[PDB]
Amino acid sequence: APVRSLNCTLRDSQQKSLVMSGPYELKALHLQGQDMEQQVVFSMSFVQGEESNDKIPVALGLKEKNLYLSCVLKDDKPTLQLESVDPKNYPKKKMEKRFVFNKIEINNKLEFESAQFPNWYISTSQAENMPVFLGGTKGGQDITDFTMQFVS
Numbered sequence: 001a002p003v004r005s006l007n008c009t010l011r012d013s014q015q016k017s018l019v020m021s022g023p024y025e026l027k028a029l030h031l032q033g034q035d036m037e038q039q040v041v042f043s044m045s046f047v048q049g050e051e052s053n054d055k056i057p058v059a060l061g062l063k064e065k066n067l068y069l070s071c072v073l074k075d076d077k078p079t080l081q082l083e084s085v086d087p088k089n090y091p092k093k094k095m096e097k098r099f100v101f102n103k104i105e106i107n108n109k110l111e112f113e114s115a116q117f118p119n120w121y122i123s124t125s126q127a128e129n130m131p132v133f134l135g136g137t138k139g140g141q142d143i144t145d146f147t148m149q150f151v152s
């Protein structure tokens with residue numbers, strides 16, 4: 001059948017919101033009130049992959065855009081990018097591995113591990129207005145925990 005998708009927003013555990021802030025750029029900042037329309041709406045697709053009760057493979061597309069979060073090596077490091085795709089072919093159930101995150105539910109928060117790069121996570125910085133990135137530990141000063149808000 002089709003792939004199933006939900007519209008949502010994400011906020012880091014410090015309650016920073018995610019925004020598009022440059023051609024292919026995702027940054028995190030403290031947002032409230034009028035400025036909250038600026039936040040990125042995701043289409044979270046439930047994709048093929050290894051699954052358990054608390055670990056669910058997803059893709060993260062930007063709502064009604066042919067753009068996906070993806071994990072690739074750049075200058076020899078696992079990095080997070082926004083990657084364009086052929087809009088005729090996406091989303092699909094069998095997303096390529098660079099697009100797949102393991103959505104992990106621990107203590108009422110979510111972590112998004114790269115399926116391609118084990119123990120690399122979607123991360124934010126403590127500082128305002130810095131890139132969303134792929135970080136190689138769910139420990140330390142960088143933030144790896146999120147909450148999801150369901151959108152109409």
Ligand SMILES: CCOc1cccc(C(=O)Nc2nnn(C)n2)c1
Nearest residue numbers: 024025026069080081082131132133
């Ligand atoms: C040397 C700059 O490298 C880049 C290039 C492009 C964007 C970014 C960024 O700020 N955030 C980002 N990029 N993709 N995702 C997803 N999140 C960083």
